Copies of this chain bind each other. A is one copy, B any other.
């Protein structure tokens, strides 16, 4: 029994250690060391030491350990042979591009595909693609990765550190209560990670707060300026204007996107997301005096303006960490002083757009395309994308002397969109 782990970043390393300790699969891993200095460094490090290592901080987690794998591939094209299980530990916008590079023999052997950090509609894309090779492929989607895992030293990228673990994760499968789902559930039990099993992967894919909040926070004129052009003075992702983007306008844009998504979800008969309850009970808490318990519970019943007021207030309450130990002057930890990553040059001197908002463009584009196919209007989504696209075009015209990545290109994701088109036609 063989497993292919796609990805060589810290997430893939943490997951491979779990497979190593708690599964019976022979484990191969594959990055893009042929084309990325990052993957190259990982390959060189593994090649030298011949082991990976996970460490933990807050103990009472069985994620730690040194392990080795069977084969580290340098490039997806090099992958050979049969694999019943493939774990996608890359970014969701690479699922199609990487799978489509595997061999026919490899693709026909795959029985289960596990999506660690999918977006809304990842499963649909992946299932429709695999359906051409397997007859009954199982696709599993998690809501998010299980925590935070980082490289503490860039010259030892085979050594990774898992710092925090999420309170709750969700998981759904195209094969309900499959034997594979059951072993994951039992595995979560071992790791002391609460896992709620959900009836569909799509439903799991919607239990991600960053789906609803990242596009409002990054795809507005203030944030997009900070990212593509810069500011005279540092600004911060989570602060109120002028220190950051957050305003009544941003918050309205946030409720409008949530409601457009709740429209799509209803079509699929997927339960709605109590966004405020999600933020307050699963992400970070606020003091009791800040929000009324009845308002958080009934968030979805409440008038639009009160929904916005509660969301605004939520964000003001975590300008600090109100549970941190105050200063002798009453000053708490500046929880909200998170800078924007700006655009930046490669080792090959190529301009890249950081993950936020480049990942949010893909995710938002897919929701757009899904919304279009159901005849569901997404006017707020629509404006998020035109804004991002106008900043990409503006960067092109203003930086003609610079090598730019494919992220600045028009008409991306055609393969992905065709596959959800075809999936929804059939279903």
| Residue ranges of A at the interface with B (Cβ–Cβ < 8 Å) | 231, 233-236, 240-243, 247-249, 287, 289-292, 303, 305-306, 308-309, 312-313, 316-317, 319-320, 322, 326-332
Chain B, Cβ-Cβ closest to A332: B243
Knowing that A233-B328, A235-B330 are A-B contacts, what are 15 other residue pairs whose CB atoms are under 8 Å apart, sorted by A's residue number? A233-B329, A233-B330, A234-B328, A234-B330, A240-B316, A240-B319, A241-B290, A242-B289, A242-B322, A242-B332, A243-B320, A243-B330, A247-B289, A248-B291, A319-B319
Question: Would you call B326 and A247 a contact (CB within 8 A)?
Answer: no
Contact check, B236 vs A330: say whether CB atoms are below 8 A apart: yes
CB proximity of A353 to chain B, nearest CB, Å: 22
Query: What is the minimal beta-carbon distance from A192 to any residue of chain B, in angstroms?
Result: 31
Provide the main secondary structure of the chain A interface.
Answer: loop
| CB–CB A240/B317 < 8 A | yes
What's the least CB distance linking A88 to chain B, in Å? 38
Q: Is the Cβ of A234 less than 8 Å from the Cβ of B305?
A: no
Q: Please provide the 3 A-B residue pairs with the shortest distance between their CB atoms, ordered closest to farther.
A: A234-B330, A309-B309, A233-B326
B316 touches A305 (CB 8 A): no
Q: Of all chain B residues, which has the CB nearest A305?
A: B306
Give Cα A331 to B303, complex, Å. Answer: 35
Contact of A289 among B241, B287, B309 (CB under 8 A): B241
Q: List the B side residues contacting A289 at CB < 8 Å.
A: 241-242, 247, 249
Count the copies: 2
Hey, which chain B residues are within 8 Å of A291, CB to CB?
248
Question: Given B240, B309, B326, which contacts A305 in the complex, CB threshold below 8 Å?
Answer: B309
Q: How far is the CA of A330 from the CA of B308 in the complex (A)?
A: 27
Q: Is the CB of A327 within 8 A of B242?
A: no
Shortest Cβ distance from A231 into chain B, in angstroms? 8
With a CB–CB cut-off of 8 A, which chain B residues contact A243?
320, 330-332
Bound CA span A368–B308, Å: 34
Q: Which residue of B lies closest to A286 (CB)?
A: B241
Name the residue in A241, A303, A319, A327 with the highest tally of chain B Cβ atoms < 10 Å from its Cβ.
Answer: A241
Contact with A287, one of B241, B312, B328 (Cβ below 8 angstroms): B241
Residues in B neighbouring A290, C-beta threshold 8 A? 240-241, 247-248
Contacts of A235 in B (CB 8 A): 330
Listed by A's residue number, 22 A-B pairs whose Cβ atoms lie within 8 Å are A231-B330, A233-B326, A233-B327, A233-B330, A236-B330, A240-B319, A241-B287, A241-B290, A242-B287, A242-B332, A243-B320, A243-B332, A247-B289, A248-B291, A248-B292, A249-B289, A303-B303, A305-B305, A305-B306, A308-B309, A312-B313, A316-B316
Nearest CB of chain B from residue A76's CB, rounded to whole Å: 42
- Residues of chain B contacted by A287 (CB below 8 angstroms): 241-242
Q: Closest CB of chain B to A251's CB: distance in Å?
A: 9
Q: Give the distance to chain B from A264, nearest Cβ to Cβ, in Å.
A: 28
In the complex, what residues of B have CB within 8 A of residue A327's CB? 233
**A221 → chain B, closest Cβ, in Å?**
10
A303-B305 Cα distance, complex, nearest whole Å:
9
Q: Which residues of B contact A234 (CB under 8 A)?
A: 328-330
Expressed in whole angstroms, the Cα–Cα distance for A235 and B331 within the complex equals 9
Nearest CB to that of A250 among chain B residues? B289
Closest to A310 in B: B248
Task: Find chain B residues with CB under 8 A from A240 CB.
Answer: 290, 316-317, 319
| Chain B residue contacts of A241, Cβ below 8 A | 287, 289-290, 317, 322
Closest chain B residue to A249 by CB distance? B289
> How far is A326 from B233 in the complex, measured between Cα atoms in Å?
7
Which residues on B sit within 8 Å (CB–CB) of A319?
240, 319
Question: Which B residues lie within 8 Å of A248 (CB)?
Answer: 290-292, 309, 313
